[PDB]
mmCIF file of all heavy atoms in Angstrom:
data_model
loop_
_atom_site.group_PDB
_atom_site.id
_atom_site.type_symbol
_atom_site.label_atom_id
_atom_site.label_comp_id
_atom_site.label_asym_id
_atom_site.label_seq_id
_atom_site.Cartn_x
_atom_site.Cartn_y
_atom_site.Cartn_z
ATOM 1 N N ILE A 33 -187.093 -35.780 -3.365
ATOM 2 C CA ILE A 33 -188.285 -36.473 -2.885
ATOM 3 C C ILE A 33 -187.787 -37.764 -2.201
ATOM 4 O O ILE A 33 -187.236 -38.673 -2.837
ATOM 5 C CB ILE A 33 -189.230 -36.835 -4.056
ATOM 6 C CG1 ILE A 33 -189.661 -35.546 -4.781
ATOM 7 C CG2 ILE A 33 -190.419 -37.626 -3.585
ATOM 8 C CD1 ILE A 33 -190.545 -35.776 -5.964
ATOM 9 N N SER A 35 -189.019 -40.530 -1.273
ATOM 10 C CA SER A 35 -189.435 -41.830 -1.744
ATOM 11 C C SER A 35 -188.949 -42.205 -3.141
ATOM 12 O O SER A 35 -189.264 -43.243 -3.653
ATOM 13 C CB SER A 35 -190.955 -41.926 -1.720
ATOM 14 O OG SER A 35 -191.528 -40.851 -2.405
ATOM 15 N N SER A 99 -198.709 -50.628 -1.298
ATOM 16 C CA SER A 99 -200.096 -50.655 -0.883
ATOM 17 C C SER A 99 -200.603 -52.084 -0.927
ATOM 18 O O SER A 99 -201.269 -52.542 -0.007
ATOM 19 C CB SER A 99 -200.939 -49.744 -1.788
ATOM 20 O OG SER A 99 -200.508 -48.399 -1.649
ATOM 21 N N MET A 119 -199.793 -45.335 13.076
ATOM 22 C CA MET A 119 -199.289 -43.966 13.134
ATOM 23 C C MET A 119 -200.074 -43.034 12.235
ATOM 24 O O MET A 119 -200.214 -43.289 11.004
ATOM 25 C CB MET A 119 -197.794 -43.935 12.757
ATOM 26 C CG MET A 119 -197.148 -42.567 12.868
ATOM 27 S SD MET A 119 -195.324 -42.616 12.626
ATOM 28 C CE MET A 119 -194.738 -41.533 13.884
ATOM 29 N N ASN A 120 -200.592 -41.962 12.806
ATOM 30 C CA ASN A 120 -201.385 -40.958 12.130
ATOM 31 C C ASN A 120 -200.611 -40.384 10.939
ATOM 32 O O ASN A 120 -199.390 -40.222 11.015
ATOM 33 C CB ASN A 120 -201.705 -39.839 13.140
ATOM 34 C CG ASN A 120 -202.455 -38.700 12.503
ATOM 35 O OD1 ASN A 120 -201.874 -37.900 11.803
ATOM 36 N ND2 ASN A 120 -203.767 -38.641 12.758
ATOM 37 N N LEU A 121 -201.306 -40.094 9.862
ATOM 38 C CA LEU A 121 -200.669 -39.592 8.627
ATOM 39 C C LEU A 121 -199.929 -38.260 8.808
ATOM 40 O O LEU A 121 -198.770 -38.143 8.426
ATOM 41 C CB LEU A 121 -201.683 -39.498 7.486
ATOM 42 C CG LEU A 121 -201.227 -39.315 6.029
ATOM 43 C CD1 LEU A 121 -202.229 -39.880 5.059
ATOM 44 C CD2 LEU A 121 -201.008 -37.832 5.754
ATOM 45 N N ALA A 122 -200.551 -37.265 9.412
ATOM 46 C CA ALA A 122 -199.886 -35.962 9.592
ATOM 47 C C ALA A 122 -198.642 -36.115 10.457
ATOM 48 O O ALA A 122 -197.691 -35.321 10.321
ATOM 49 C CB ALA A 122 -200.860 -34.952 10.218
ATOM 50 N N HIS A 123 -198.612 -37.114 11.330
ATOM 51 C CA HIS A 123 -197.443 -37.301 12.197
ATOM 52 C C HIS A 123 -196.384 -38.161 11.552
ATOM 53 O O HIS A 123 -195.365 -38.451 12.226
ATOM 54 C CB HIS A 123 -197.875 -37.880 13.546
ATOM 55 C CG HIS A 123 -198.582 -36.901 14.434
ATOM 56 N ND1 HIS A 123 -198.209 -36.718 15.746
ATOM 57 C CD2 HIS A 123 -199.582 -36.043 14.195
ATOM 58 C CE1 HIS A 123 -198.949 -35.749 16.272
ATOM 59 N NE2 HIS A 123 -199.805 -35.342 15.358
ATOM 60 N N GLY A 124 -196.591 -38.579 10.326
ATOM 61 C CA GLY A 124 -195.560 -39.366 9.642
ATOM 62 C C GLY A 124 -195.999 -40.745 9.195
ATOM 63 O O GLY A 124 -195.242 -41.432 8.516
ATOM 64 N N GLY A 125 -197.207 -41.136 9.531
ATOM 65 C CA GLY A 125 -197.719 -42.437 9.112
ATOM 66 C C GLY A 125 -198.131 -42.467 7.649
ATOM 67 O O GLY A 125 -198.438 -41.404 7.048
ATOM 68 N N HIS A 126 -198.188 -43.615 7.035
ATOM 69 C CA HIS A 126 -198.576 -43.708 5.631
ATOM 70 C C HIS A 126 -200.095 -43.837 5.488
ATOM 71 O O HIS A 126 -200.804 -44.194 6.448
ATOM 72 C CB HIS A 126 -197.873 -44.909 4.960
ATOM 73 C CG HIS A 126 -198.179 -45.015 3.502
ATOM 74 N ND1 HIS A 126 -198.970 -46.003 2.949
ATOM 75 C CD2 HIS A 126 -197.821 -44.207 2.480
ATOM 76 C CE1 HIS A 126 -199.097 -45.792 1.660
ATOM 77 N NE2 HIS A 126 -198.391 -44.710 1.321
ATOM 78 N N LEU A 127 -200.584 -43.542 4.279
ATOM 79 C CA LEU A 127 -202.000 -43.621 3.944
ATOM 80 C C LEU A 127 -202.598 -44.951 4.330
ATOM 81 O O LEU A 127 -203.689 -45.055 4.897
ATOM 82 C CB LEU A 127 -202.211 -43.426 2.437
ATOM 83 C CG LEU A 127 -202.272 -41.996 1.910
ATOM 84 C CD1 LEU A 127 -201.921 -41.993 0.428
ATOM 85 C CD2 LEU A 127 -203.662 -41.425 2.143
ATOM 86 N N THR A 128 -201.850 -46.023 4.027
ATOM 87 C CA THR A 128 -202.302 -47.395 4.316
ATOM 88 C C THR A 128 -202.154 -47.782 5.765
ATOM 89 O O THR A 128 -202.296 -48.932 6.132
ATOM 90 C CB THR A 128 -201.556 -48.418 3.434
ATOM 91 O OG1 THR A 128 -200.142 -48.342 3.686
ATOM 92 C CG2 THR A 128 -201.806 -48.133 1.962
ATOM 93 N N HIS A 129 -201.843 -46.789 6.625
ATOM 94 C CA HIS A 129 -201.702 -47.029 8.050
ATOM 95 C C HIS A 129 -202.913 -46.546 8.847
ATOM 96 O O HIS A 129 -202.818 -46.274 10.024
ATOM 97 C CB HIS A 129 -200.425 -46.362 8.562
ATOM 98 C CG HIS A 129 -199.180 -46.948 8.014
ATOM 99 N ND1 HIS A 129 -197.934 -46.384 8.213
ATOM 100 C CD2 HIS A 129 -198.983 -48.065 7.277
ATOM 101 C CE1 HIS A 129 -197.025 -47.075 7.596
ATOM 102 N NE2 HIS A 129 -197.624 -48.109 7.001
ATOM 103 N N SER A 131 -205.510 -44.249 7.179
ATOM 104 C CA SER A 131 -206.133 -43.016 6.697
ATOM 105 C C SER A 131 -207.568 -43.333 6.317
ATOM 106 O O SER A 131 -207.817 -44.343 5.665
ATOM 107 C CB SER A 131 -205.387 -42.483 5.447
ATOM 108 O OG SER A 131 -205.910 -41.221 5.111
ATOM 109 N N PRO A 132 -208.495 -42.472 6.702
ATOM 110 C CA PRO A 132 -209.928 -42.622 6.428
ATOM 111 C C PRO A 132 -210.324 -42.591 4.966
ATOM 112 O O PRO A 132 -211.420 -43.020 4.600
ATOM 113 C CB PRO A 132 -210.550 -41.465 7.212
ATOM 114 C CG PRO A 132 -209.512 -40.409 7.092
ATOM 115 C CD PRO A 132 -208.218 -41.168 7.357
ATOM 116 N N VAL A 133 -209.423 -42.142 4.098
ATOM 117 C CA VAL A 133 -209.665 -42.066 2.659
ATOM 118 C C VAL A 133 -209.000 -43.223 1.954
ATOM 119 O O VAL A 133 -208.881 -43.243 0.724
ATOM 120 C CB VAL A 133 -209.126 -40.767 2.040
ATOM 121 C CG1 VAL A 133 -209.739 -39.572 2.734
ATOM 122 C CG2 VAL A 133 -207.598 -40.749 2.148
ATOM 123 N N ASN A 134 -208.515 -44.193 2.713
ATOM 124 C CA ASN A 134 -207.827 -45.363 2.207
ATOM 125 C C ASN A 134 -208.579 -46.627 2.672
ATOM 126 O O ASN A 134 -209.364 -46.527 3.596
ATOM 127 C CB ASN A 134 -206.408 -45.351 2.708
ATOM 128 C CG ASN A 134 -205.606 -46.584 2.315
ATOM 129 O OD1 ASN A 134 -205.587 -47.565 3.045
ATOM 130 N ND2 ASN A 134 -204.958 -46.537 1.152
ATOM 131 N N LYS A 138 -211.257 -47.465 5.960
ATOM 132 C CA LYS A 138 -212.659 -47.804 5.690
ATOM 133 C C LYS A 138 -213.027 -49.219 6.153
ATOM 134 O O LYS A 138 -214.160 -49.423 6.609
ATOM 135 C CB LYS A 138 -212.918 -47.711 4.192
ATOM 136 C CG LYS A 138 -212.818 -46.330 3.671
ATOM 137 C CD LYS A 138 -213.430 -46.233 2.270
ATOM 138 C CE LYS A 138 -213.207 -44.885 1.669
ATOM 139 N NZ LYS A 138 -211.756 -44.575 1.629
ATOM 140 N N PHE A 174 -193.469 -45.788 8.769
ATOM 141 C CA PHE A 174 -193.786 -44.383 8.513
ATOM 142 C C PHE A 174 -193.370 -43.960 7.108
ATOM 143 O O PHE A 174 -192.613 -44.663 6.429
ATOM 144 C CB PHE A 174 -193.019 -43.573 9.544
ATOM 145 C CG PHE A 174 -191.553 -43.917 9.609
ATOM 146 C CD1 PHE A 174 -190.661 -43.444 8.652
ATOM 147 C CD2 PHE A 174 -191.078 -44.795 10.584
ATOM 148 C CE1 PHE A 174 -189.336 -43.799 8.652
ATOM 149 C CE2 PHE A 174 -189.753 -45.163 10.599
ATOM 150 C CZ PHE A 174 -188.855 -44.650 9.617
ATOM 151 N N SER A 175 -193.871 -42.796 6.690
ATOM 152 C CA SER A 175 -193.528 -42.236 5.381
ATOM 153 C C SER A 175 -192.817 -40.922 5.591
ATOM 154 O O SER A 175 -192.127 -40.446 4.676
ATOM 155 C CB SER A 175 -194.836 -42.021 4.565
ATOM 156 O OG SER A 175 -195.433 -43.239 4.207
ATOM 157 N N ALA A 176 -192.989 -40.330 6.751
ATOM 158 C CA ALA A 176 -192.354 -39.044 7.040
ATOM 159 C C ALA A 176 -191.845 -38.820 8.446
ATOM 160 O O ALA A 176 -191.977 -37.739 9.031
ATOM 161 C CB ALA A 176 -193.331 -37.882 6.661
ATOM 162 N N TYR A 177 -191.274 -39.840 9.059
ATOM 163 C CA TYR A 177 -190.707 -39.757 10.402
ATOM 164 C C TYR A 177 -189.190 -39.859 10.232
ATOM 165 O O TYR A 177 -188.720 -40.771 9.525
ATOM 166 C CB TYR A 177 -191.239 -40.845 11.303
ATOM 167 C CG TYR A 177 -190.675 -40.847 12.721
ATOM 168 C CD1 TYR A 177 -190.795 -39.712 13.555
ATOM 169 C CD2 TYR A 177 -190.022 -41.980 13.213
ATOM 170 C CE1 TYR A 177 -190.280 -39.737 14.855
ATOM 171 C CE2 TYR A 177 -189.503 -42.014 14.502
ATOM 172 C CZ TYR A 177 -189.638 -40.880 15.316
ATOM 173 O OH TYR A 177 -189.122 -40.867 16.606
ATOM 174 N N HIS A 203 -189.677 -47.127 3.422
ATOM 175 C CA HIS A 203 -188.708 -46.036 3.371
ATOM 176 C C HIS A 203 -187.279 -46.353 3.818
ATOM 177 O O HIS A 203 -186.318 -45.837 3.270
ATOM 178 C CB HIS A 203 -189.189 -44.844 4.181
ATOM 179 C CG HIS A 203 -189.870 -43.768 3.362
ATOM 180 N ND1 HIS A 203 -191.175 -43.820 2.978
ATOM 181 C CD2 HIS A 203 -189.344 -42.610 2.849
ATOM 182 C CE1 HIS A 203 -191.468 -42.735 2.268
ATOM 183 N NE2 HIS A 203 -190.387 -41.991 2.162
ATOM 184 N N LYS A 229 -187.659 -47.582 -3.107
ATOM 185 C CA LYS A 229 -187.257 -46.402 -2.370
ATOM 186 C C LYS A 229 -185.747 -46.422 -2.083
ATOM 187 O O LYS A 229 -184.927 -46.340 -2.969
ATOM 188 C CB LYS A 229 -188.057 -46.256 -1.082
ATOM 189 C CG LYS A 229 -189.523 -45.957 -1.330
ATOM 190 C CD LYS A 229 -190.287 -45.762 0.009
ATOM 191 C CE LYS A 229 -191.729 -45.408 -0.227
ATOM 192 N NZ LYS A 229 -192.399 -46.508 -0.931
ATOM 193 N N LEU A 320 -188.404 -33.355 7.792
ATOM 194 C CA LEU A 320 -189.492 -32.463 7.483
ATOM 195 C C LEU A 320 -189.156 -31.041 7.892
ATOM 196 O O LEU A 320 -188.486 -30.823 8.930
ATOM 197 C CB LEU A 320 -190.797 -32.836 8.218
ATOM 198 C CG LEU A 320 -191.596 -34.050 7.832
ATOM 199 C CD1 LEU A 320 -192.818 -34.131 8.739
ATOM 200 C CD2 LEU A 320 -192.024 -33.962 6.368
ATOM 201 N N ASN A 345 -191.455 -32.164 -2.311
ATOM 202 C CA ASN A 345 -192.878 -32.474 -2.275
ATOM 203 C C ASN A 345 -193.510 -31.896 -1.050
ATOM 204 O O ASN A 345 -192.966 -31.999 0.059
ATOM 205 C CB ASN A 345 -193.153 -33.969 -2.431
ATOM 206 C CG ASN A 345 -193.066 -34.741 -1.092
ATOM 207 O OD1 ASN A 345 -192.124 -35.442 -0.821
ATOM 208 N ND2 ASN A 345 -194.102 -34.558 -0.255
ATOM 209 N N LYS A 346 -194.652 -31.232 -1.222
ATOM 210 C CA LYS A 346 -195.414 -30.647 -0.105
ATOM 211 C C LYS A 346 -195.760 -31.802 0.828
ATOM 212 O O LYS A 346 -196.126 -32.876 0.391
ATOM 213 C CB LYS A 346 -196.701 -29.989 -0.610
ATOM 214 C CG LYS A 346 -197.536 -30.953 -1.431
ATOM 215 C CD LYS A 346 -198.688 -30.238 -2.118
ATOM 216 C CE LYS A 346 -199.433 -31.194 -3.045
ATOM 217 N NZ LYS A 346 -200.513 -30.502 -3.770
ATOM 218 N N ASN A 347 -195.637 -31.572 2.133
ATOM 219 C CA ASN A 347 -195.936 -32.608 3.076
ATOM 220 C C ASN A 347 -196.584 -32.103 4.353
ATOM 221 O O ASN A 347 -196.185 -31.089 4.888
ATOM 222 C CB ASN A 347 -194.605 -33.316 3.489
ATOM 223 C CG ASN A 347 -194.785 -34.807 3.573
ATOM 224 O OD1 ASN A 347 -194.536 -35.515 2.594
ATOM 225 N ND2 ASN A 347 -195.159 -35.320 4.730
ATOM 226 N N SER A 348 -197.616 -32.811 4.797
ATOM 227 C CA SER A 348 -198.312 -32.424 6.007
ATOM 228 C C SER A 348 -197.313 -32.570 7.133
ATOM 229 O O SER A 348 -196.405 -33.420 7.079
ATOM 230 C CB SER A 348 -199.510 -33.345 6.234
ATOM 231 O OG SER A 348 -200.318 -33.385 5.111
ATOM 232 N N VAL A 349 -197.475 -31.757 8.178
ATOM 233 C CA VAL A 349 -196.606 -31.858 9.317
ATOM 234 C C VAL A 349 -197.502 -32.046 10.540
ATOM 235 O O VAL A 349 -198.743 -31.973 10.427
ATOM 236 C CB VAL A 349 -195.796 -30.575 9.547
ATOM 237 C CG1 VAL A 349 -194.896 -30.330 8.332
ATOM 238 C CG2 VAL A 349 -196.702 -29.375 9.783
ATOM 239 N N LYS A 354 -203.319 -26.937 7.589
ATOM 240 C CA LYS A 354 -203.782 -27.098 6.241
ATOM 241 C C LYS A 354 -204.088 -28.547 5.851
ATOM 242 O O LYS A 354 -203.683 -29.469 6.534
ATOM 243 C CB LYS A 354 -202.722 -26.520 5.250
ATOM 244 C CG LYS A 354 -202.457 -25.052 5.454
ATOM 245 C CD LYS A 354 -203.729 -24.235 5.393
ATOM 246 C CE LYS A 354 -203.487 -22.800 5.740
ATOM 247 N NZ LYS A 354 -202.580 -22.173 4.748
ATOM 248 N N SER A 355 -204.839 -28.747 4.764
ATOM 249 C CA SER A 355 -205.199 -30.051 4.306
ATOM 250 C C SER A 355 -204.019 -30.670 3.536
ATOM 251 O O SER A 355 -203.143 -29.963 3.089
ATOM 252 C CB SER A 355 -206.432 -29.992 3.422
ATOM 253 O OG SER A 355 -206.179 -29.267 2.244
ATOM 254 N N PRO A 356 -204.004 -31.991 3.411
ATOM 255 C CA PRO A 356 -202.971 -32.772 2.713
ATOM 256 C C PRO A 356 -202.531 -32.252 1.355
ATOM 257 O O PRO A 356 -201.394 -32.480 0.957
ATOM 258 C CB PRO A 356 -203.599 -34.173 2.620
ATOM 259 C CG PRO A 356 -204.389 -34.244 3.874
ATOM 260 C CD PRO A 356 -205.056 -32.897 3.910
ATOM 261 N N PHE A 357 -203.401 -31.575 0.634
ATOM 262 C CA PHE A 357 -203.070 -31.096 -0.691
ATOM 263 C C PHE A 357 -202.342 -29.760 -0.637
ATOM 264 O O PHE A 357 -201.593 -29.390 -1.573
ATOM 265 C CB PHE A 357 -204.320 -30.932 -1.556
ATOM 266 C CG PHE A 357 -204.020 -30.965 -3.019
ATOM 267 C CD1 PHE A 357 -203.742 -32.170 -3.687
ATOM 268 C CD2 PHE A 357 -203.992 -29.793 -3.772
ATOM 269 C CE1 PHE A 357 -203.438 -32.216 -5.071
ATOM 270 C CE2 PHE A 357 -203.659 -29.811 -5.151
ATOM 271 C CZ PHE A 357 -203.382 -31.020 -5.780
ATOM 272 N N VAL A 358 -202.505 -29.056 0.482
ATOM 273 C CA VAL A 358 -201.834 -27.758 0.658
ATOM 274 C C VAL A 358 -200.637 -27.852 1.590
ATOM 275 O O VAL A 358 -199.540 -27.454 1.202
ATOM 276 C CB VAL A 358 -202.851 -26.713 1.227
ATOM 277 C CG1 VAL A 358 -202.144 -25.422 1.522
ATOM 278 C CG2 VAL A 358 -203.975 -26.522 0.234
ATOM 279 N N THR A 359 -200.857 -28.360 2.794
ATOM 280 C CA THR A 359 -199.810 -28.561 3.800
ATOM 281 C C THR A 359 -199.050 -27.311 4.241
ATOM 282 O O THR A 359 -199.102 -26.263 3.587
ATOM 283 C CB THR A 359 -198.754 -29.599 3.387
ATOM 284 O OG1 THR A 359 -197.953 -29.063 2.332
ATOM 285 C CG2 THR A 359 -199.413 -30.873 2.926
ATOM 286 N N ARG A 363 -191.095 -32.118 2.596
ATOM 287 C CA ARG A 363 -190.300 -33.312 2.991
ATOM 288 C C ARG A 363 -189.067 -33.387 2.099
ATOM 289 O O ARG A 363 -189.134 -33.173 0.882
ATOM 290 C CB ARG A 363 -191.123 -34.584 2.826
ATOM 291 C CG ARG A 363 -190.466 -35.778 3.461
ATOM 292 C CD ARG A 363 -191.323 -37.021 3.286
ATOM 293 N NE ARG A 363 -191.501 -37.301 1.848
ATOM 294 C CZ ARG A 363 -192.185 -38.348 1.378
ATOM 295 N NH1 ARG A 363 -192.725 -39.213 2.237
ATOM 296 N NH2 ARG A 363 -192.318 -38.537 0.077
ATOM 297 N N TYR B 54 -192.320 -40.700 -9.064
ATOM 298 C CA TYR B 54 -193.447 -40.907 -8.170
ATOM 299 C C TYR B 54 -194.450 -39.855 -8.606
ATOM 300 O O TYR B 54 -194.122 -38.675 -8.642
ATOM 301 C CB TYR B 54 -193.029 -40.647 -6.719
ATOM 302 C CG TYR B 54 -193.422 -41.772 -5.778
ATOM 303 C CD1 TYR B 54 -192.454 -42.614 -5.254
ATOM 304 C CD2 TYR B 54 -194.777 -42.037 -5.503
ATOM 305 C CE1 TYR B 54 -192.783 -43.717 -4.488
ATOM 306 C CE2 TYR B 54 -195.116 -43.150 -4.718
ATOM 307 C CZ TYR B 54 -194.102 -43.991 -4.229
ATOM 308 O OH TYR B 54 -194.428 -45.122 -3.504
ATOM 309 N N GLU B 56 -198.275 -39.565 -7.568
ATOM 310 C CA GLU B 56 -199.597 -39.824 -7.000
ATOM 311 C C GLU B 56 -200.534 -38.716 -7.380
ATOM 312 O O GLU B 56 -200.148 -37.548 -7.469
ATOM 313 C CB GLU B 56 -199.524 -39.941 -5.484
ATOM 314 C CG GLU B 56 -198.648 -41.070 -4.981
ATOM 315 C CD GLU B 56 -198.760 -41.269 -3.493
ATOM 316 O OE1 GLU B 56 -199.007 -40.255 -2.782
ATOM 317 O OE2 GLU B 56 -198.619 -42.415 -3.028
ATOM 318 N N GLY B 57 -201.805 -39.058 -7.596
ATOM 319 C CA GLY B 57 -202.800 -38.125 -8.019
ATOM 320 C C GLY B 57 -203.089 -38.277 -9.488
ATOM 321 O O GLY B 57 -202.855 -39.335 -10.058
ATOM 322 N N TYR B 63 -199.312 -35.070 -6.157
ATOM 323 C CA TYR B 63 -198.840 -34.822 -4.792
ATOM 324 C C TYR B 63 -197.336 -34.728 -4.721
ATOM 325 O O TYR B 63 -196.761 -34.720 -3.615
ATOM 326 C CB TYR B 63 -199.298 -35.924 -3.851
ATOM 327 C CG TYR B 63 -200.761 -35.798 -3.437
ATOM 328 C CD1 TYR B 63 -201.793 -36.183 -4.270
ATOM 329 C CD2 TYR B 63 -201.083 -35.286 -2.174
ATOM 330 C CE1 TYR B 63 -203.112 -36.063 -3.870
ATOM 331 C CE2 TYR B 63 -202.390 -35.160 -1.756
ATOM 332 C CZ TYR B 63 -203.421 -35.551 -2.623
ATOM 333 O OH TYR B 63 -204.734 -35.431 -2.224
ATOM 334 N N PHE B 64 -196.677 -34.687 -5.863
ATOM 335 C CA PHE B 64 -195.231 -34.540 -5.979
ATOM 336 C C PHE B 64 -194.905 -33.559 -7.105
ATOM 337 O O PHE B 64 -195.746 -33.348 -7.994
ATOM 338 C CB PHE B 64 -194.554 -35.859 -6.323
ATOM 339 C CG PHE B 64 -194.825 -37.000 -5.364
ATOM 340 C CD1 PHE B 64 -196.031 -37.671 -5.373
ATOM 341 C CD2 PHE B 64 -193.884 -37.346 -4.404
ATOM 342 C CE1 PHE B 64 -196.311 -38.702 -4.517
ATOM 343 C CE2 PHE B 64 -194.135 -38.393 -3.515
ATOM 344 C CZ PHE B 64 -195.344 -39.059 -3.555
ATOM 345 N N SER B 253 -211.159 -41.741 -6.874
ATOM 346 C CA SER B 253 -210.765 -41.845 -5.467
ATOM 347 C C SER B 253 -210.559 -43.335 -5.050
ATOM 348 O O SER B 253 -209.681 -43.622 -4.242
ATOM 349 C CB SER B 253 -211.842 -41.244 -4.572
ATOM 350 O OG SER B 253 -211.901 -39.859 -4.774
ATOM 351 N N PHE B 256 -207.124 -44.204 -6.194
ATOM 352 C CA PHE B 256 -206.176 -43.465 -5.359
ATOM 353 C C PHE B 256 -206.806 -42.279 -4.691
ATOM 354 O O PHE B 256 -207.407 -41.448 -5.366
ATOM 355 C CB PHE B 256 -204.989 -42.970 -6.150
ATOM 356 C CG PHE B 256 -204.079 -42.084 -5.362
ATOM 357 C CD1 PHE B 256 -203.159 -42.637 -4.455
ATOM 358 C CD2 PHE B 256 -204.203 -40.696 -5.422
ATOM 359 C CE1 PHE B 256 -202.370 -41.818 -3.644
ATOM 360 C CE2 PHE B 256 -203.436 -39.884 -4.590
ATOM 361 C CZ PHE B 256 -202.538 -40.411 -3.715
ATOM 362 N N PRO B 257 -206.624 -42.120 -3.364
ATOM 363 C CA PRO B 257 -205.847 -42.944 -2.441
ATOM 364 C C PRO B 257 -206.563 -44.172 -1.917
ATOM 365 O O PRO B 257 -206.097 -44.825 -1.003
ATOM 366 C CB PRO B 257 -205.554 -41.973 -1.301
ATOM 367 C CG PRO B 257 -206.796 -41.209 -1.218
ATOM 368 C CD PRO B 257 -207.112 -40.915 -2.665
ATOM 369 N N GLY B 258 -207.738 -44.463 -2.492
ATOM 370 C CA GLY B 258 -208.494 -45.628 -2.065
ATOM 371 C C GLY B 258 -207.760 -46.966 -1.983
ATOM 372 O O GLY B 258 -207.602 -47.506 -0.885
ATOM 373 N N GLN B 260 -204.652 -47.842 -4.047
ATOM 374 C CA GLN B 260 -203.269 -47.899 -4.565
ATOM 375 C C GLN B 260 -202.430 -46.727 -4.118
ATOM 376 O O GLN B 260 -202.955 -45.745 -3.539
ATOM 377 C CB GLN B 260 -203.237 -47.968 -6.093
ATOM 378 C CG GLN B 260 -203.724 -49.240 -6.730
ATOM 379 C CD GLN B 260 -203.628 -49.243 -8.238
ATOM 380 O OE1 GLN B 260 -204.012 -50.214 -8.893
ATOM 381 N NE2 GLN B 260 -203.077 -48.138 -8.803
ATOM 382 N N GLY B 261 -201.149 -46.796 -4.374
ATOM 383 C CA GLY B 261 -200.248 -45.755 -4.016
ATOM 384 C C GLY B 261 -199.845 -45.070 -5.327
ATOM 385 O O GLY B 261 -200.715 -44.697 -6.101
ATOM 386 N N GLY B 262 -198.548 -45.000 -5.567
ATOM 387 C CA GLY B 262 -198.131 -44.396 -6.809
ATOM 388 C C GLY B 262 -198.346 -45.337 -8.000
ATOM 389 O O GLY B 262 -198.205 -46.553 -7.847
HETATM 390 N N1 FFO C 501 -197.093 -38.586 6.319
HETATM 391 C C1 FFO C 501 -197.121 -38.818 5.018
HETATM 392 N N2 FFO C 501 -196.522 -38.186 4.005
HETATM 393 C C2 FFO C 501 -196.658 -38.581 2.692
HETATM 394 C C3 FFO C 501 -197.389 -39.676 2.308
HETATM 395 C C4 FFO C 501 -198.110 -40.429 3.388
HETATM 396 O O1 FFO C 501 -198.848 -41.431 3.157
HETATM 397 N N3 FFO C 501 -197.912 -39.920 4.669
HETATM 398 N N4 FFO C 501 -197.493 -40.044 0.894
HETATM 399 C C5 FFO C 501 -197.347 -41.325 0.582
HETATM 400 O O2 FFO C 501 -197.435 -41.665 -0.620
HETATM 401 C C6 FFO C 501 -197.456 -38.890 0.053
HETATM 402 C C7 FFO C 501 -198.635 -37.936 0.265
HETATM 403 N N5 FFO C 501 -199.924 -38.605 -0.138
HETATM 404 C C8 FFO C 501 -201.210 -38.250 0.263
HETATM 405 C C9 FFO C 501 -202.230 -38.674 -0.674
HETATM 406 C C10 FFO C 501 -203.540 -38.340 -0.353
HETATM 407 C C11 FFO C 501 -203.809 -37.667 0.876
HETATM 408 C C12 FFO C 501 -205.171 -37.288 1.311
HETATM 409 O O3 FFO C 501 -205.417 -37.360 2.504
HETATM 410 N N6 FFO C 501 -206.097 -36.901 0.442
HETATM 411 C C13 FFO C 501 -207.541 -36.689 0.809
HETATM 412 C C14 FFO C 501 -207.734 -35.159 1.102
HETATM 413 C C15 FFO C 501 -206.910 -34.118 0.125
HETATM 414 C C16 FFO C 501 -207.109 -32.569 0.094
HETATM 415 O O4 FFO C 501 -206.477 -31.937 0.964
HETATM 416 O O5 FFO C 501 -207.947 -32.022 -0.787
HETATM 417 C C17 FFO C 501 -208.407 -37.043 -0.384
HETATM 418 O O6 FFO C 501 -207.944 -37.141 -1.552
HETATM 419 O O7 FFO C 501 -209.636 -37.232 -0.186
HETATM 420 C C18 FFO C 501 -202.752 -37.320 1.741
HETATM 421 C C19 FFO C 501 -201.425 -37.614 1.442
HETATM 422 C C20 FFO C 501 -196.246 -38.112 0.447
HETATM 423 N N7 FFO C 501 -196.144 -37.697 1.736
#
Side-chain angles (χ1 to χ4, degrees):
Chain A
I33 300 178
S35 54
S99 297
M119 184 173 221
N120 177 285
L121 194 153
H123 286 231
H126 184 250
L127 277 158
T128 60
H129 294 170
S131 187
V133 303
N134 175 270
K138 295 193 186 59
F174 51 79
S175 292
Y177 177 58
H203 262 84
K229 293 183 177 62
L320 288 181
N345 84 254
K346 55 188 173 184
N347 222 91
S348 306
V349 299
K354 300 305 175 63
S355 63
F357 203 76
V358 175
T359 71
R363 192 181 60 177
Chain B
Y54 230 107
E56 299 187 329
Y63 281 79
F64 303 78
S253 294
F256 172 79
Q260 291 183 180

